[PDB]
Write an enzyme that holds these catalytic residues in place. Structure first.
Site, PDB file in Angstrom:
ATOM      1  N   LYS A 170       0.843  -1.186   0.000  1.00 25.67           N
ATOM      2  CA  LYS A 170       0.000   0.000   0.000  1.00 25.67           C
ATOM      3  C   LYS A 170       0.881   1.241   0.000  1.00 25.67           C
ATOM      4  O   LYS A 170       1.826   1.347   0.790  1.00 25.67           O
ATOM      5  CB  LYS A 170      -0.923  -0.027   1.214  1.00 25.67           C
TER       6      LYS A 170
HETATM    7  O1  E4P Z   1      -7.806   0.923   3.134  1.00 26.98           O
HETATM    8  C1  E4P Z   1      -8.300   1.167   4.223  1.00 26.98           C
HETATM    9  C2  E4P Z   1      -8.413   2.583   4.744  1.00 26.98           C
HETATM   10  O2  E4P Z   1      -7.156   2.990   5.289  1.00 26.98           O
HETATM   11  C3  E4P Z   1      -9.487   2.581   5.827  1.00 26.98           C
HETATM   12  O3  E4P Z   1     -10.628   1.952   5.228  1.00 26.98           O
HETATM   13  C4  E4P Z   1      -9.796   3.976   6.398  1.00 26.98           C
HETATM   14  O4  E4P Z   1     -10.854   3.932   7.371  1.00 26.98           O
HETATM   15  P1  E4P Z   1     -11.235   5.174   8.356  1.00 26.98           P
HETATM   16  O5  E4P Z   1     -11.661   6.292   7.439  1.00 26.98           O
HETATM   17  O6  E4P Z   1     -12.389   4.671   9.192  1.00 26.98           O
HETATM   18  O7  E4P Z   1      -9.984   5.473   9.154  1.00 26.98           O
END
Ligand code: E4P
Ligand code: E4P
Ligand code: E4P
Ligand code: E4P
Ligand code: E4P
Ligand code: E4P
Ligand code: E4P
Ligand code: E4P
Ligand code: CL
Lengths: 223, 223, 217, 218, 218, 223, 223, 217
Positions: B86
């Site tokens: 990522k």
């Molecule tokens: O890929 C995953 C993202 O980092 C995550 O879904 C973010 O979630 P949040 O907005 O609840 O922190």
């Protein structure tokens, strides 16, 4: 959607290519002359750009008459297989595009302001049509609507000419171009750079990295 | 539509995986920071998730510089075939994605908040792009509209990058994602659980069982 | 739809007002600081605009605290009847707007980026609300959609706050604002200059004078 | 929807008013000079149109400067209360319109090609705005879309300026103007005449005459 | 929506009015001549209809020339205040309509086949416009689209001319006219009769009767 | 939207009225005869209903011919000012409605299956038109579409006749009637009762009352 | 659109009220149970909220029987003119609403999950109806669609009952409610806070202040 | 679109199958318990249906636990090749479906009330998914909208699970199912009986035989 950089600045070109989001370059004598400073020669600029850019590089013809256009276009073509000759939407321009298309010299029809102009250029065999959306905006017509109609027309007839959205002024020209399905946009380096930005990206990254320090004081990722 | 679990909580991951409804896992530095407390090390957490989960497991680099991203990306990739690296939507992130894509390392571009950021990530060669719908909701913009536009854009250009809807807060994000046709949603465990449930399911099953007792006091189906 | 000029450049303001198509002016701390250079004082620039311009002139407070905002607002108000106090969309700002409104001091809530912020400003009693369309465009969101939603919301509740479209970058922001039905647009000088122009007007004018020379040398 | 005839031909004008479908006239030097033949004074023409027409008669100013426009306008006004002064969409034109408005002299802003120009003219107090739809068609843009946008804009702001569709080339410009709800169209006499015709009308008329001479040979 | 009977048969008119669904009558030379038998003369039929019908009765002129049209029209009017004079969409027709409306004589413009013709007739002051939807259907044009456009145009300008859908061929012309909001349809008696019918109505009647025989065998 | 109860059961009527959601009653000889048991006389049933119901009470005429209809309708009217005479869409029915409307006797035209039938009844002066939506559904036509068209027609001409949606079979007939803007629906008591139910209402109330016991063991609200 | 705060937390209520953005408060037995802990009594909490808040304050009866609802409703009403009696969508609840409406006691019908329940409450004479959008979201139905239908229904019949959107989870519920035209939204404190905020607001104010310092080092505006 | 009969009434099943318009049958524990009265055993009823009906016959497990469901499913499966195992939309149900699918045993996931439940069932590999439109109608939600969304979702992902519209109450559920493009509808006998009928068919038939008697006494 391809993205061309509308510049003659070699550092900008290299940087954009390294980002993996630049597919070619559009130039004009003004952009090239801008770089022709401190010893750098006009012709050296265009030649280097042609050399280093894998993709298409558009170069304008200045001749306004048929014979001058074709002779100039042939000289430009001689500079690199990736050179694309930029020719205006005029009666002599159409004749030149038809002739150059026969010679397998790639062409880019500029100063397109309605969909039928774009269609005529495609019929003459042009590789790209470049409608100037910002200049339509300037006169109180939503320029993106012309792009939408050209996309529909080109789709109707499986036309292989690429729509090259030009005179781009802001990121929404780019967004709408992508949603419409335009083949290409050409943008200045500053617009290009703005396309990757968003305040929630910045804030989100800062938060991630703050939280990571809780588990890794030195901020490292040791695996 | 694939469903990933958006958590670094090992218990949640084993539970969801057993329901057979979880196709992969997404983590980020925040989620891992929630888990790496009281002696638990982030490296052990990451390895354990890669172990338990057969599908893609996204792990986010922490460096903000091209070279550090690539270096960390290679270490992540080296931990298992199911690891997905990522990378944030930044200048350096796009550079890293271009390089890693050329090395056949699967990537996931995160902190995406508009459709053009998503397109740039896809152009750089990213495997998945993760737009954050809930964080857009947070700032008064309907986040799902961005997913709709990305789907349209990706369809226009036959882009193979998978749309991975992230920052999901509720089952309607999931529903709308499916109707739009996003490739993947990643959801928190509480949201995952809720997806299977409906009051009329509960009531219907209770009634079936009550009626069956008239015919079989033991509640068995003996064939 | 009213048309305001978005600048603190006195030369631009004089020029636009002389054209007769400027109904008021908006300023902000950036615009003013841009002009207040090389000896020119922000206080003189503000007073000069208020005198030159007949219509509403928006001047923004700089305090971020409720007390400071109200204090500055009262000073701005006292500079002239056409002064409108610009207040940022913050918690203290909404408090200031409510107080200033009850004191019958005209207000303009700025730095608005979604329709719910606009609604909150209206609920506090603000005279104008100024959503920033160009800054939304900058971050990849079609800013005009926010204006369309605000117009709908204001219509639903018969809200008297005027929608003042700001951060305008081009004549299509302007066209779309008028088709939506926004109360006011505020435009930079370069945009203002273009609004009256069209190449077919120019051509038509030339043709007219040529036809006329036939009729009457 | 009002219908103006865009010419200076007095016979054409009488004819149209007699049909009860002509509410006024739009002229310009070219059209007026056309009728200035065989001993007819150019100024006589304008003056007669003004006398005969029981409705607005638009006459264009030729000056390009504010001061010339307003002096020219006041003189035009002096020829008849039904005179409407046509003034181009320019900086000086808008200034002149604002002045003439305050002097209660009716105005018609011409050479309008987009809706914001039309709004600027409205804001100057103009009695009519005349967008040129045919000239937009000429350059590959559907001119009627501009009329549709102006109608919406004027509706939004309860604008009293009348939309006067000009540069009309065919009966579909007229049909679309009416469906949009433009206040006025101005058409050439040949367009005007074509508006009342349809081949099924002609066929029906012949059919009714034949049916009738069965019912009554005499 | 008003319903006129397209007939000159008095028995049909009386029965229709008793159903409470007939508001007036439209005629033409053929319809009247059909009833002009067995002693009954052309003129008496029109007089009898005028007397019995508490509403508008349209009667067509036969003159194709302006003067003739108006002469006839004044005669028809003399026969009763509810008389309405049908006049075709032609140059002379428009002239006659303008003249007659100024004399407070009610008029019905016939042979209208597009929306602009309808507008022209309205501008000339006509009481009703009668587009012939069936004849449009006949030539491969969905006649009801024309009624739709006329309704929009008339709404735009608060036009008081009534849209009278004519040349009706089936109950769907009637349904669509009502959904569009046309002011009037004129239908033959047979179409009128069909409008009340539905097989589920018939089935339901039979069921009611059977259900009732159970409740009260008496 | 008014709601009529389609029943002759006095207990159902009282109960629905007490809920505050019943505005009148529709009857037929079958519904009345059903109650005429254990000493209760047919005529006594209708008279009591007329007495106790403030709003409209529809009563069917059984005569199929004009004279019988009007004579019967006058007798029904004589039973209560709130009596509404139900007359079928037939040639004799229209004549009767016209006559009765003149006498200021309220009328309800039944067995309406298309919008033009509804319009004809309104022109004859009818107080209510009753299209039978469930019976259209029975023959493979969406009966609610007829209601929608009648609403549009009636709106077009500011028609004062009320649309009384009949042959109602389920709660969605009722929902769609309300969204369309029908003046009235008539429903059986069981359908009426179902209209107020939803499993999240039940579950939500149970949760509230469970939580209240935490602060008030006896479950009381002492103020 | 009115904005109520959906909480029984006194600190939250005083804070929101001071922002001048809160027009009233809604409570329910659960919210009060969260507050009435560690010695705090529910009666003191209710009275205190009625005291602090100038606008409507909804307090829910706990009895499930008609007589108990009315009795409790009268006690609630007696505590202050701004008290609004909250009644569940039940058979007894509708009976209670009819009675209380006739006594000119303001009422709020809660636990509404579809548009017909809302209509029934309005017919009974209720002052506000509270559909629960988030709980519909929970079960995989877009809760805002129910608000849209209620708005349409209420408009059709010129119903004076106010639509009070409840179970709000995020700022997009609020946005959609405003665009639909709901009369009121009631929101949790965290959602309320978020409504005022946007990253571009923060960034824009910071830049203004930075630029102002060039002209006034002290950051003051001296006029 | 296939048409199944939703009943365990053997008389109805024989009648519908004889009409040639029944492509299969669905049962559930309620329907079966309704028939298994006064000496009749549920086991005999199930076996009888499987023999009478050529097409798919759905029989529902009663266990709520994974192990019990799979055990019962295998027994159902062994009753005949046309048996389809009906499994409720629960966590254990999804587990059972995944196992049964890998064993090539046809499955039908029931008690589905929204499109995401349907998607989960498809992801587990279910042969049919059966959303209950009439029970949604009962609670004031237009059940057919759920079918429309499921069709869209399944189209998006080229999902091979068949949409089996259940809890059908009337012929418009059926019409709307076909216009949406649902794979299967399952209908009660009273609905099935009505599908072939229309009053204009009846009238047309009568008119035809009358016209014919003219042509040929
Ligand atoms: O890929 C995953 C993202 O980092 C995550 O879904 C973010 O979630 P949040 O907005 O609840 O922190
Ligand atoms: O080919 C490039 C064009 O010259 C350029 O995009 C247009 O620029 P402008 O329209 O903004 O002047
Ligand atoms: O009200 C005016 C705003 O401060 C201004 O329009 C912002 O303009 P910009 O975003 O284009 O700088
Ligand atoms: O005002 C009338 C205009 O001068 C006229 O309609 C222009 O017509 P054209 O554009 O066809 O020349
Ligand atoms: O006014 C009535 C019209 O003349 C008539 O309806 C048209 O009939 P036709 O077009 O079928 O002749
Ligand atoms: O007036 C009432 C009607 O008879 C009733 O609503 C229709 O019932 P059915 O169509 O369901 O038989
Ligand atoms: O009226 C208020 C409701 O009881 C409340 O909004 C429900 O919220 P919840 O769904 O978050 O419990
Ligand atoms: O699959 C069939 C379902 O169990 C059945 O269709 C439910 O029907 P009902 O809800 O009408 O009882
Ligand atoms: Cl949420």
């Amino acid at each position: 959607m391809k993205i061309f950089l509308d510049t003659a600045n070699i550092d900008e070109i290299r940087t954009g290519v390294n980002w993996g989001i630049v597919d070619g370059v559009t130039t004009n004598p003004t952009l090239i002359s801008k770089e022709a400073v401190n010893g750098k020669k006009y012709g050296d600029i265009i030649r280097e750009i042609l050399k280093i850019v894998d993709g298409p590089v558009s170069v304008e013809v200045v001749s306004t008459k048929y014979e001058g256009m074709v002779e100039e276009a042939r000289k430009i073509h001689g500079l690199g297989d990736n050179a694309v000759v930029k020719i205006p939407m005029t009666e002599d321009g159409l004749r030149a595009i038809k002739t150059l298309s026969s010679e397998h010299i790639n062409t880019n029809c500029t100063l397109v302001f309605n969909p039928i102009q774009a269609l005529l250029a495609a019929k003459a065999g042009v590789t790209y049509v470049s409608p100037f959306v910002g200049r339509l905006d300037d006169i109180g017509e939503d320029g993106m609507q012309i792009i939408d109609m050209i996309r529909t027309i080109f789709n109707n007839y499986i036309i292989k000419t690429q729509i090259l959205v030009a005179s781009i002024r802001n990121p929404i020209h780019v967004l709408r171009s992508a949603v419409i399905g335009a083949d290409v946009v050409t943008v200045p380096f500053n617009v290009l750079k703005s396309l990757m930005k968003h305040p929630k990206t910045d804030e989100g990254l800062a938060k991630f990295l703050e939280d990571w320090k809780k588990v890794s004081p030195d901020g490292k990722l040791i695996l």
